[PDB]
A paper describes a structure:
Omicron (B.1.1.529), the most heavily mutated SARS-CoV-2 variant so far, is highly resistant to neutralizing antibodies, raising concerns about the effectiveness of antibody therapies and vaccines. Omicron is the most heavily mutated variant to emerge so far, with more than 30 mutations in its spike (S) protein, 15 of which occur in the receptor binding domain (RBD). To delineate the structural basis for antibody-mediated neutralization, we determined the cryo-electron microscopy (cryo-EM) structure of a prefusion-stabilized Omicron S trimer in complex with representative Fab fragments. The two highly potent antibodies against Omicron (XGv347 and XGv289, with IC50 values of 0.006 and 0.016 μg ml−1, respectively), one monoclonal antibody (XGv282 with IC50 of 0.268 μg ml−1) with intermediate neutralizing activities against Omicron, but high neutralizing activities against the other four VOCs, and a monoclonal antibody (XGv265 with IC50 of 7.479 μg ml−1) with more than 500-fold decreased neutralization against Omicron, but potent neutralization against four other VOCs were selected for structural investigations.
Overall XGv289, XGv282 and XGv265 bind patches surrounding the right shoulder of RBD with various orientations, but in a manner similar to those observed for LY-CoV1404, BD-812 and REGN10987—antibodies that are known to generally neutralize most VOCs with high potency—but showing decreased, to varying degrees, binding and neutralizing activities against Omicron owing to the presence of new N440K and G446S mutations. In addition, the mutation E484A breaks the hydrogen bond with R74 from XGv282 HCDR2 and losses of charge interactions between R346 and K444 on WT RBD, and D56 and D58 on XGv265 LCDR2 owing to conformational alterations, further decreasing the binding of XGv282 and XGv265 to the Omicron S, respectively. Together, G446S, acting as a critical mutation site, can alter the local conformation at the binding interface, conferring greater resistance to a class of antibodies bound at the right shoulder of the RBD. XGv347, XGv289, XGv282 and XGv265 bound Omicron S with 5- to 40-fold lower affinity compared with their binding to WT S, although the same binding modes were observed for the two orthologues.
Residue numbers in the entry:
A (entry chain L): 1 to 111
B (entry chain H): 2 to 119
C (entry chain E): 330 to 530
The structure:
Amino acid sequence: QSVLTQPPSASGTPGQRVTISCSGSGSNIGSNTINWYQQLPGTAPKVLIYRNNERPSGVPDRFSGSKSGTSASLTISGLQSEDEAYYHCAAWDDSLNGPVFGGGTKLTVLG
Amino acid sequence: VQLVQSGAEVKKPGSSVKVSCKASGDTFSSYTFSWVRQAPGQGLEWMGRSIPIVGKAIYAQEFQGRVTISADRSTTTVYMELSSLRSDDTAVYYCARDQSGFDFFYYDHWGQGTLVAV
Amino acid sequence: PNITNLCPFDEVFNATRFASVYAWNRKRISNCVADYSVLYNLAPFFTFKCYGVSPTKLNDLCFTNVYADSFVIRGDEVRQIAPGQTGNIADYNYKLPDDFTGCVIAWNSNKLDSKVSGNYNYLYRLFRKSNLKPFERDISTEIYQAGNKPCNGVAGFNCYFPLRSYSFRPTYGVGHQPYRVVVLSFELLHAPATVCGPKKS
């Protein structure tokens, strides 16, 4: 629904390196950094990463975020079975002077 | 931080919503506060932002006027008022606290909101 | 001339947070030995003017008592901090007397003070009945009744909130960016000296 397009679903097996990409337009994502967020099922969603390169306190470290112009990619190594959740990308859209959020992905951790 | 809000309640189309969010454990006024709704199991999209220091507020251009946001510094609280509800507004609402107003880090401290069904 | 003591100018000029113009946190320093070479040699000072004494012979002077007051402002009104100058910031929040003897330092700080969401920690008042006496704080948030109509409680028309906030985000151009402003006020040798720079030989 937003400028930041996003595939609907993603899959990952244990011990598998998986990659998820979020892209938009050069008006907002080509000139501003990207934050990534985790909608964990059923209750309050939690932050994943800000500025694509540094993480908050207490969060694990296997997440690896990177930015290349339009495309921001998060890579997960050693994915665990409790990580099945929505993953979202957000950025401060400067055209509308407000935050804009991605479509979201269903990360499914197959047993 | 310690964020709380009102409980979940169900309404009918054509009604109005008064909903409230409270923050404790920090200085309420110094931080601005954002309101974002999300349909159950759907995508995320921002609604508005409010300024406890002044009271000036900004809303989504697609939803100007029909919604309103208020803040109080003496009681240290923020409120939405929603008008002209419909089935499109069946969603959970989240009051987020900005830790830093910079691209380096923003929009982290953030609560569990209230679900609304119309 | 040893020299022995020191004074924390890195406490003020490198402070991570500054108060806004309505409640500027004046700090009085005494029993110091301050070197301005670490100050002046810094690169990004785009505005360094002084009035009472020349900025060259500062290191060979003694000061009776020094007040350093720091805050942030918009670039457009940086020229308004001059003594006797009028306008908005130099009339309703913080103004300097004509007999001012210290001097000011203003520069651009978009590294940290700039906020992509705008200024919602700082602000600058617009409404006040009387022009404030120089170097006087003002923290009261009494609602300024604009017209003849008295009013308390909430806002309205003829009833306005006395506070307005800036918005310092990177899209704002030069003069609209967060310019830190510090002011040193002192009396030039009319009392026993407690702070003097490194008396050089």
